[PDB]
Amino acid sequence: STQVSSGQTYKITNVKAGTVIDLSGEDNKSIIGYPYHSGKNQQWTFNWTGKAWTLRSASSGSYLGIEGTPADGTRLVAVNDPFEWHIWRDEANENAFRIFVPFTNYNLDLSGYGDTTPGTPVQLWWTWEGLHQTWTIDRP
């Protein structure tokens, strides 16, 4: 297994689609599912703040975050300030994780029920059993 460790850098792979969380090279802002090609924009440095994880783009130094109120369909975006996440192991595949906005029922969701199309947005969605809401955190 791969330990998630503060100060280490990982790729984050959708269990259903097999694409990774990718900071779009089109705008350096939008967070999308894209096939892994060892891009620095596909690599995220994890830091434990004492209470939560922050995920920093290896390419841009922006953090993985959101803007405005968590809801179904809230887009993930690059943000300037560290944004705190909580991770919980999944029930269907216990080597995988669900990644939540703290104190909410909203977790990362690869949109369109895990569409494999490159560029598919990564968003928040209310937690439910679909495997497109589950992610492995892997060595780059």
Ligand X SMILES: OC[C@H]1O[C@@H](O)[C@H](O)[C@@H](O)[C@H]1O
Binding site for ligand X (CB under 6 A): 22, 24-26, 34, 39, 41-42, 119
Q: Cβ closer to ligand X: 18 or 119? A: 119
CA dihedral 133, 49, 45, 69 (to 10 degrees): 40
Q: Cβ closer to ligand X: 19 or 107? A: 19
| Structure tokens belonging to residue 85 | 């996440």
The distance of closest approach from Cβ of residue 99 to ligand X in the complex, given in angstroms and rounded to an integer, is: 19
Q: What does the alpha-carbon distance between residue 72 and residue 64 come to, in Å, rounded to a whole number?
A: 17
The distance of closest approach from Cβ of residue 39 to ligand X in the complex, given in angstroms and rounded to an integer, is: 4
Q: Cβ closer to ligand X: 9 or 127? A: 9
Q: Cβ closer to ligand X: 73 or 119? A: 119
- Burial string for 44-58 (b: 16+ CB within 10 Å, else e) reads bbbbeeeebbbbbbb
The distance of closest approach from Cβ of residue 90 to ligand X in the complex, given in angstroms and rounded to an integer, is: 25
Q: Which of 108, 94, 92, 77 is CA-nearest to residue 14?
A: 108
The backbone torsions φ and ψ at residue 114, rounded to the nearest 5 degrees and listed phi first, read 80, 40
The distance of closest approach from Cβ of residue 29 to ligand X in the complex, given in angstroms and rounded to an integer, is: 11
Please indicate if the annotation marks 37 as binding a ligand.
yes
Binding residues for beta-D-galactose: 22, 25, 37, 41
Residue list for the binding site: 22, 25, 37, 41
